[PDB]
Amino acid sequence: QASVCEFVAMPVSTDLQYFRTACNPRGRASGMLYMGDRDADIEAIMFDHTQSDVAYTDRATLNPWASQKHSYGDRLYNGTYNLTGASPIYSPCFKFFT
Amino acid sequence: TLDVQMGRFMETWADMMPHHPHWVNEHLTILQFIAPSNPRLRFELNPAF
Amino acid sequence: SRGGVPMLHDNVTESLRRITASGGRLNPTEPLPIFGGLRPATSAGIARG
């Protein structure tokens, strides 16, 4: 069975040492795993770019084209806005953006 | 006659800008642009806009 | 830390602290609370310790 490849745009001057380990395709590490103070912290991890990244703690996000609240990759691949809903093909990075 | 217009622009421009413009700071490297202290970071979303 | 000899112009110290705050994760809070401990602004979750 042929597996589809989804393409995410990002700047050319990208630190290549990110992709040499187990990385995140969104460009900013995120998720359910980091909590301990309140309930409205998942959105602050995933979208608030005032504070730095949780994993690589010297920057906000590797790409600013697929990481913000309403960026290109987030407007295209997030399941909430449902742009690719008429597509009958599975998107392999739906789970990383929703 | 393009003299009076340039003079009016130079007179108005001496106090039109009270701070540094955000589109002329293009000497930033990638590590400083990407850092969260950059106020221009939240306005860079699409690659064509 | 507080206690040393401050610089003569307050705007010089304000500009220096604002530039220093860029490029650093830990920073004092923006209002600079007088009669306080200057606690750094807490962040969200912790990844690797």
Name its key features.
part of a larger assembly; 3 chains; 98 residues; little secondary structure; 12% helix; 0% strand; globular; viral protein
The gist of it:
It is classed as viral protein. The structure is cut from a larger assembly and holds 3 copies of chain A. With 98 residues, chain A is mostly loops.
Walkthrough of the structure:
This is part of a larger assembly, with three copies of chain A. Chain A has helices at residues 42-47, 72-77. Chain A is mostly loops. In chain A, 26% of the residues are buried. Chains in contact: A-B, A-C, B-C. The A-C interface holds A 29, 33-37, 41, 44-45, 48, 51-52, 54-55, 57-58 and C 25, 42-48. Chain A: It comes from Varicella-zoster virus (strain Dumas). Chain A: It is found in: Virion; Host nucleus. Chain A: Belongs to the herpesviridae major capsid protein family.
Supply the number of helical segments of chain A.
Answer: 2
Percentage beta strand of chain A? under 5%
Please count the beta strands of chain A (DSSP E, at least 2 residues each).
Answer: 0
**Strand/helix succession of chain A:** HH
Helicity level of chain A: 10-25%
Which sheet architecture does the biggest sheet of chain A show? none
PDB class: viral protein
Keywords: VZV, capsid structure, viral protein
Entry title: E-hexon capsomer of the VZV C-Capsid
Chains A, B, C: Major capsid protein
